[PDB]
Amino acid sequence: HQPQEYAVSVSVGEVKLKGNLVIPNGATGIVLFAHGSGSSRYSPRNRYVAEVLQQAGLATLLIDLLTQEEEEIDLRTRHLRFDIGLLASRLVGATDWLTHNPDTQHLKVGYFGASTGGGAALVAAAERPETVQAVVSRGGRPDLAPSALPHVKAPTLLIVGGYDLPVIAMNEDALEQLQTSKRLVIIPRASHLFEEPGALTAVAQLASEWFMHYLR
Numbered sequence: 001h002q003p004q005e006y007a008v009s010v011s012v013g014e015v016k017l018k019g020n021l022v023i024p025n026g027a028t029g030i031v032l033f034a035h036g037s038g039s040s041r042y043s044p045r046n047r048y049v050a051e052v053l054q055q056a057g058l059a060t061l062l063i064d065l066l067t068q069e070e071e072e073i074d075l076r077t078r079h080l081r082f083d084i085g086l087l088a089s090r091l092v093g094a095t096d097w098l099t100h101n102p103d104t105q106h107l108k109v110g111y112f113g114a115s116t117g118g119g120a121a122l123v124a125a126a127e128r129p130e131t132v133q134a135v136v137s138r139g140g141r142p143d144l145a146p147s148a149l150p151h152v153k154a155p156t157l158l159i160v161g162g163y164d165l166p167v168i169a170m171n172e173d174a175l176e177q178l179q180t181s182k183r184l185v186i187i188p189r190a191s192h193l194f195e196e197p198g199a200l201t202a203v204a205q206l207a208s209e210w211f212m213h214y215l216r
Contacts, residue, residue, distance in 0.1 A: 007020060015090075017064050018063070019064070020061070020062045021104075022054050022059060023104070023107075028108060028215065029110055031112050031215070032061045034113040034120045035114055052204035081116075085123070091121060095132065110133055118137030119142055136210055139167060160184070161187050
């Protein structure tokens with residue numbers, strides 16, 4: 001009936017990353033989520049969005065980009081949570097795992113990157129141009145990954161909140177650096193984490209439309 005949630009261990013070289021995999025019947029696309037700094041696969045924001053994508057018939061993989069051990073150390077040092085190179089490599093690793101797993105090998109991979117995850121998603125997408133078919137960045141700072149931007153081949157949707165004025169101009173700047181099919185959309189009167197009534201729902205709705213079109 002309703003799709004099942006699987007607790008998976010995603011191997012990326014020497015590390016194992018915890019994941020929550022859901023694959024509705026008949027799914028053709030899968031959305032890999034890059035959580036924001038200090039967050040996890042349990043993010044209520046990403047879980048809400050994931051449930052919306054699942055309902056539209058998209059598979060989802062909510063993953064911890066850091067190991068459990070790393071999360072405990074980083075909680076005090078913060079020496080890993082803003083390391084965009086590392087986070088992108090972890091996302092590339094999770095992409096390869098999806099590619100080589102018989103349960104998901106047939107699925108078209110897309111990325112949903114939240115806050116700092118957005119930049120990490122774009123850096124990873126530039127590293128897997130034939131594999132990653134779409135990217136959505138929710139309130140990110142893509143402009144801070146300028147070497148990756150013009151190499152991204154995955155159709156990219158940048159979403160920002162209208163009250164998050166600094167991040168808007170930076171997404172506008174990033175949009176110009178992208179050379180692929182692209183769009184920037186603004187959710188009016190929404191702040192950084194889209195906490196205002198209806199904001200997060202709009203993010204999910206926009207992301208669903210995008211992934212459904214591009215992960216065919």
